[PDB]
């Protein structure tokens, strides 16, 4: 949905240099971008939201 929002928005791809394929970044740690650019706000802000939603999920699922 964010990969979608890159092409949907006028000038996103140049702000999002190193992509947002977070699937490969976690499944294979060698392909992961730097720890200086992840902390940049356009890529940091939504991913921190994702983590919060994720903690809500792993709460809800283990409760049934």
């Amino acid at each position: 949905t964010l990969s979608e929002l890159i092409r949907t928005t006028l000038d996103a791809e140049k702000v999002f240099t190193q992509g947002l394929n977070i699937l490969e970044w976690l499944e294979n740690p060698s392909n992961t971008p730097d720890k200086d650019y992840l902390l940049s706000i356009p890529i940091s802000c939504p991913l921190i939201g994702v983590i919060q939603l994720a903690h809500y999920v792993v709460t809800a699922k283990l409760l049934g």
Binding site: S30, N31, T32, D34
Partner: protein, 64 residues
């Protein structure tokens, strides 16, 4: 302030690589600093060398 920048390409560079650039102030030329740098990858192989002529800040000499 940066006046003259040259860059020697020794070897090639893959995506997702961690470049380790060391910067040295080595000399002067009539109030311009000589910067010499040296960039290595993970495998500690020489990739980039070069020189940088950089101006002194705006200077005023005042005599006692």
């Amino acid at each position: 302030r940066v006046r003259g920048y040259t860059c020697q390409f020794v070897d090639m560079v893959l995506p997702n690589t961690a470049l380790k650039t060391s910067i040295q102030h080595v000399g002067m030329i009539n109030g311009r600093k000589l910067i010499k740098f040296e960039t290595r990858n993970e495998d500690d192989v020489v990739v980039l060398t070069g020189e940088a002529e950089i101006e002194q800040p705006v200077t005023t000499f005042v005599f006692t």
